Amino acid sequence: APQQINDIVHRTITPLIEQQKIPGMAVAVIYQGKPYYFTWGYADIAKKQPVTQQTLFELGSVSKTFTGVLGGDAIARGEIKLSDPTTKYWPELTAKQWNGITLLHLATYTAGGLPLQVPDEVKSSSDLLRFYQNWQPAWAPGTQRLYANSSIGLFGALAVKPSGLSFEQAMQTRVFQPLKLNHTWINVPPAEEKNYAWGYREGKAVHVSPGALDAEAYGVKSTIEDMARWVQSNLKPLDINEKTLQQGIQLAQSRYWQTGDMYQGLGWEMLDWPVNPDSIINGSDNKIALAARPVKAITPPTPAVRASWVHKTGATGGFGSYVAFIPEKELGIVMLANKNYPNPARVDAAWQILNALQ
Ligand SMILES: O=C(O)c1sccc1S(=O)(=O)NC1CC1
Numbered sequence: 001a002p003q004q005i006n007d008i009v010h011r012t013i014t015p016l017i018e019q020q021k022i023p024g025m026a027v028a029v030i031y032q033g034k035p036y037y038f039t040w041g042y043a044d045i046a047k048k049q050p051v052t053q054q055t056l057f058e059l060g061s062v063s064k065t066f067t068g069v070l071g072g073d074a075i076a077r078g079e080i081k082l083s084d085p086t087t088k089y090w091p092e093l094t095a096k097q098w099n100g101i102t103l104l105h106l107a108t109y110t111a112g113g114l115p116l117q118v119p120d121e122v123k124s125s126s127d128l129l130r131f132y133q134n135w136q137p138a139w140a141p142g143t144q145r146l147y148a149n150s151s152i153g154l155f156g157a158l159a160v161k162p163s164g165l166s167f168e169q170a171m172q173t174r175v176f177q178p179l180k181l182n183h184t185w186i187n188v189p190p191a192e193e194k195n196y197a198w199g200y201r202e203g204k205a206v207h208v209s210p211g212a213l214d215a216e217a218y219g220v221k222s223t224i225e226d227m228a229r230w231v232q233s234n235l236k237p238l239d240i241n242e243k244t245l246q247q248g249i250q251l252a253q254s255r256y257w258q259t260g261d262m263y264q265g266l267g268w269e270m271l272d273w274p275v276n277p278d279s280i281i282n283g284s285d286n287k288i289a290l291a292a293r294p295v296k297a298i299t300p301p302t303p304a305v306r307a308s309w310v311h312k313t314g315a316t317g318g319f320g321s322y323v324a325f326i327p328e329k330e331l332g333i334v335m336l337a338n339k340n341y342p343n344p345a346r347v348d349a350a351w352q353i354l355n356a357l358q
């Protein structure tokens with residue numbers, strides 16, 4: 001590998017792993033469009049299994065980037081429109097507070113205060129209906145952003161309804177398969193169990209628990225190789241042969257709302273490049289990332305901007321992941337760890353690496 005990449009990655013990640021007591025980690029750097037891979041530590045401490053380029057990690061909320069792109073693909077197919085009222089796809093949703101809440105609002109967390117999680121009590125389809133029918137918004141639609149699995153999770157479920165496919169079938173056949181992400185899963189199959197890392201939370205081995213809208217909001221597992229390929233595909237969508245998927249990638253990086261220096265895409269979030277590193281690092285802290293923030297509508301949305309820092313953090317109980325890229329520089333990074341360690345540490349390391357290579 002190029003020594004500059006070797007050196008910047010090792011000198012950044014080694015101390016991170018030590019300081020954060022991360023059991024296992026995989027990193028990919030995409031540099032002038034080519035991936036370079038690095039691994040450390042253990043996928044399974046008890047069984048002494050090392051992290052490899054084939055190890056599966058829980059992506060947590062990085063999954064939202066796949067949901068956003070799948071939704072974009074459905075727009076490009078003419079199956080849905082972001083301007084469609086939510087009720088068009090869920091006619092049983094008759095409660096008056098849904099008037100004016102569109103698929104755009106669901107996808108971008110701007111519906112007016114849908115909650116961070118779907119309640120664990122929701123264990124059926126009728127339960128889910130009751131939950132959304134009874135939810136009372138704090139704010140008018142399109143006025144404030146509040147990061148929420150119940151928001152983008154419902155968007156994902158509704159976006160695939162016209163296709164007739166389950167969310168998992170749609171994702172597999174329309175996103176994973178065309179991009180040759182052959183080791184990326186919503187449900188880990190028995191064939192891949194030997195590669196599925198344990199997550200570690202307070203030293204205990206854990207995997208993500210089932211929940212309503214899990215697939216749509218936080219449910220994807222993938223390897224460092226497939227995630228490198230996901231980054232390549234989002235860096236350079238015009239190289240994708242399937243037209244609707246190329247278009248879906250473009251739509252997911254369009255800029256729909258602004259708060260501070262950040263622009264909200266579908267799943268992806270973006271800042272102008274060059275970025276103030278303090279903006280992305282401090283901004284990634286959940287104390288900020290999960291706050292209720294007033295948004296400026298971008299009317300109409302700005303198509304995907306090349307000179308952007310495009311990124312997404314994600315976690316589950318036992319895993320912590322980060323992906324960032326800069327289309328203008330053909331540069332990107334994926335960091336997958338089997339411990340949920342603080343977001344700002346991820347973004348600081350990612351910026352130190354990409355800044356050195358830019
Ligand atoms: O992370 C921790 O708190 C702890 S505490 C005990 C084990 C672990 S761990 O195995 O998950 N961490 C890795 C460095 C050894």
Ligand SMILES: O=C(O)c1sccc1S(=O)(=O)NC1CC1
Nearest residue numbers: 258259260261293294295296297
């Ligand atoms: O610009 C606006 O009108 C609005 S209105 C609500 C948010 C914003 S903003 O965050 O993009 N601008 C803030 C930093 C000054």
Ligand SMILES: O=C(O)c1sccc1S(=O)(=O)NC1CC1
Nearest residue numbers: 247250251254255301302303304
């Ligand atoms: O990108 C957008 O937001 C939009 S929204 C309408 C068209 C476009 S685009 O043509 O510039 N690029 C992708 C959709 C086909």
Ligand SMILES: O=C(O)c1sccc1S(=O)(=O)NC1CC1
Nearest residue numbers: 060061062218313314315316317
């Ligand atoms: O993924 C994330 O970063 C975030 S940030 C806020 C919620 C979530 S999540 O619910 O999907 N995962 C939780 C266990 C850490």
Ligand SMILES: O=C(O)c1sccc1S(=O)(=O)NC1CC1
Nearest residue numbers: 117208209211218315316317318
């Ligand atoms: O199981 C996990 O790791 C995840 S990942 C996202 C939520 C959960 S959960 O089931 O604990 N729900 C709690 C965080 C609010």
